[PDB]
């Protein structure tokens, strides 16, 4: 290919992220306000993950757990630092919204491999390393093919096949498989 792989896919990523950022902007400001006054005035925390050509970038996400400490300082267990409304924000995936800015700025695509830990970079073999030949995605070929089994090698098989055979057909197929995925629980 080339015409869609090297150009048109990025435009849909930019416009889509820009449209969705303006579309959910009241919810974004509302979420940040609640977190500011009841969780943490830092609101946003970043996540360093490998991306295109394995280059590290920070993933933006809303902070949901408090920054509470202990009499000795070792933080409370995760049970007591995550209130009911924090779980509600997590449940509605509102904390995930800042990643639209990641998609907009080029860190990620709308459809692509899942951003995983930096630890796995030396573990990937010569075939699985190719999953970083494309930008990571909010959804992708591996996310829609979940079969209640943790076969990392088969997830990586889907990842490598996607990076090699990126098509406008395939992207539409993933998009339909993603909305049909959410029609179920």
Author numbering: -1 to 183
What did the article's authors report about this structure?
pmcPhosphoglycosyl transferases (PGTs) catalyze the transfer of a phosphosugar group from a UDP-sugar substrate to a membrane-resident polyprenol phosphate (most commonly in bacteria undecaprenol or decaprenol phosphate) acceptor. PglC is a monotopic phosphoglycosyl transferase that embodies the functional core structure of the entire enzyme superfamily and catalyzes the first membrane-committed step in a glycoprotein assembly pathway. Catalysis proceeds via a covalent intermediate with both soluble and amphiphilic substrates remaining in aqueous and membrane environments, respectively.
In the current study, further insight is derived from the structure of selenomethionine (SeMet)-derivatized PglC co-crystallized with UDP. UDP was utilized in co-crystallization, as it significantly stabilized this PGT as shown by nanoscale differential scanning fluorimetry (nanoDSF). Although the resolution was low (3.01 Å), and the ligand was not stoichiometrically bound (10–20% occupancy of any ligand to the active site), it was possible to make correlations between the presence or absence of electron density and the loop conformations. When the eight copies of PglC in the ASU were overlaid, the mobile loop is the main region of structural divergence between the chains. In monomers G and H, which are closed, as well as A and B (intermediate conformation), a comparatively large number of electrons is present in the site where the nucleotide would be expected to bind. In contrast, monomers C, D, E, and F, which are open, all have significantly fewer electrons present. Analysis of the mobile loop in the context of active-site ligand occupancy shows that chains with a greater positive electron density were in a more closed conformation than those with little or no density. Monomers occupying the same position within each of the four lattice dimers do not always occupy the same mobile loop position; thus, the difference in the observed loop conformation is likely due to differential binding at the active site.
